[PDB]
Symmetry: D4
């Protein structure tokens, strides 16, 4: 549990802000908040994601050490997002998979990937105390 009145905020590179808008808003369903020449800000599942116009995006990507996203308490929200990503043509870096298999902290996961190679991981933990 966390304070519902605060927001987590993250800044990531975007090579092209219109292209970032299509991914995050048009496909992923995030809400567009503020737009400037050099950045767009998003309501990203209730937290704030800011996409900064940048040339410093990763040209090649691997799972570690950078990725972000949402861990859902309710499996329905996780399943809905997976369905939405599949129907809206959103690319998956890694499809539906379990991590830490057989441990109490086992979680279901998928990774989406934005046009600037930022990795989005969405998680569901079978024991909700393991979300940290």
């Amino acid at each position: 549990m966390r304070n519902p009145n605060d927001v987590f905020h993250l800044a990531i590179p975007a090579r092209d802000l219109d292209e970032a808008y299509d991914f995050y808003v048009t496909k992923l369903g995030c809400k567009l908040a503020r737009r400037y020449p050099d950045r767009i800000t998003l309501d990203f599942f209730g937290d704030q994601l800011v996409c900064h116009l940048s040339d410093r995006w990763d040209r090649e990507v691997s799972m570690y050490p950078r990725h972000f996203g949402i861990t859902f308490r309710d499996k329905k929200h996780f399943d809905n997002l997976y369905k939405l990503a599949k129907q809206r043509g959103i690319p998956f870096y890694h499809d539906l998979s379990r991590r830490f298999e057989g441990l109490i902290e086992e979680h279901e996961t998928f990774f989406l990937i934005d046009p600037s190679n930022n990795l989005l991981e969405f998680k569901y933990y079978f024991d909700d105390r393991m979300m940290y």
Copy 2:
């Protein structure tokens, strides 16, 4: 309000896990959740931060395009954290300042810097609608 039952999660590089513990837990006051040979997981203001043991941390640091943190609804929480950082000697990348001064989306901001040059930004907006 964001869903208090979910958590945002972020992965960042840590050049040394004990050193990351010293920064995030001992000085910053986050709570330690889980430890593995290759990562530590943290309750970071109610969201999840995971520090991954990695050599791919930035040797040269600039404000953009990557940073993360919390935007506090209650200025007391923002002020408390600044005081904590100052008293406990946590390095600042950028001391207390204003961004978008005089504009509706004006916010107070300070940046901390972790031992692997990850930038933490904490914010307080004068109009709470501008948190996105």
Copy 3:
């Protein structure tokens, strides 16, 4: 309290969808959700507003019998929005005023006007029971 999990939704005419975006998102600070050739959908202070592309908008405007908006429990939210409207040059139909002055159900009010002559009223009641 109203159910925080539901949303009120309203449909109104927009003579031009880009112009409606400029008003509701760029100036008023609402968040853009979904776009179609015939409508845009908005997170309007946490409720849903849908602007429908239409020629059936009022050319001549009077206060009654149609208008909509938000009644804020916290006067700070009301004051912030007024300041936003003023600073960002959003047209007022009626500037800051009182309705039912001296009576238990007295409230502060201002009306904004969108480009298709829809009237937005924002209110604050001195006795919160009088919000209905």
Copy 4:
């Protein structure tokens, strides 16, 4: 999600306030709040609906560009309302139907119609993120 402490408010025309009371209170089950010679105010599912004595109600009606109502997170609340409308003899402008069929934003809908030809739409979205 939205602030449970605020209320959405909407003003609509009513040709006859006693007739509006019978529809909104006696049949629909909304609560009567305040009554004046020229208007009645209602607790309309936790938001505020105000029915203004007016001759400016729509003599002929079509679905667009004006209608209002509630989007329910819990399907049981949607189903209960449908059942209530059928049992209490409330007229339907459009019976139970799906809109945006096959899209992630598909929703179930029905439209009621008040005596002054105001259209009430009630919605349930199969993916709750699509409520905006």
Copy 5:
């Protein structure tokens, strides 16, 4: 906290249902829910009050052993209601006073009296633990 999803309900006698409406809805500001030939039901500060058409109302009134009302956590709500009662001319049985003065369980109190001699008591406790 009490469960916000439940309601307390009380039944009391009313010698005349229209007269009870005038008292509870028009003057006191409660909302009218349902009406039948033998009773009216009310949203009484979020709980349910039902006034039953009856000749068994007390002709002679004393403070004990029967009265009902609301104990407000926030003194502003208590003060607002007193002001409402005074401005709108609602009869008091007992004007603003203190009970258990100087003791930890001290509370401000006033009593209103309905047309069938039911006693309404509203309270505010200086120590919120003493509300039970």
Copy 6:
């Protein structure tokens, strides 16, 4: 829905305070709050019930026009209470029954009766909007 921070308070007669304690605390499971020579106060499902030492209790009782209790949103809470009353030997004035049968506002009900002939009614509505 109602403010979880306030409490409904009701005063009722008790012919004997020890006997009232046995009924409300020992059998019904309410919590004993404060005790004085002339009254006991109770945490009665999160609201406040005060039992006043009195000779003015009803020597003969009928369902109307006085009774009180709790309307539960969750049927499990209603069913649990019924089970508890049966197992703990609490007398029922009226056993499990439906009222307003076939109406949208149909509710399940039972009435318990305290030693001083005060009637407690517990309710569950099949449409939760009908709780007022």
Copy 7:
């Protein structure tokens, strides 16, 4: 936030159950829940305290390693309880004091002592993050 739907529970020795009632309910203002020959159960500030009839209570008391109580977010609750303890003559083991003075985790503290030498500590932290 901790889960408001769960309770912490603690068991402690009581040399005499009536004497424990006098302390926890009559003086401290906790609510009595259940009684058995060998124990009493209490709503202790919303958590459960159970006093077990026992001869294994400490005859000689020191601050460490055993004590319990509540840490209040709102200083008013802390101040109210101190005033209650003082006015009602509840024995203090340690009067109002500061622990970790000048440090970020500074808190106000006082200790009460029950009749079986159990130590109750109540705290208020100047930075609410330091409550853990």
Copy 8:
């Protein structure tokens, strides 16, 4: 129900703080908050547990009169904890058992035991009103 903004705090002896960390953090999954030479503090299911370096731990233990833990409203949380304790090799003083069998206040229970012989009891009540 209890205030989600406060925390219950308990102090218990630990013969060795590293050994206490392994039990409470590594095995039980509690979060490590603050560490000093003489104590560790823990986020223990949202309440605060403090383990004080001490020689005054119980060399022999019995169920009464001292133990602590959490009563879960949701059986899934209780079942998850039991599963975690079994998989992580946490010792049980008493395995899964019912107490107050056949009473309305019947509850399911298990007792874990820490290295310094402190007893942890976790409970689930079949009637949630019986949690006090």
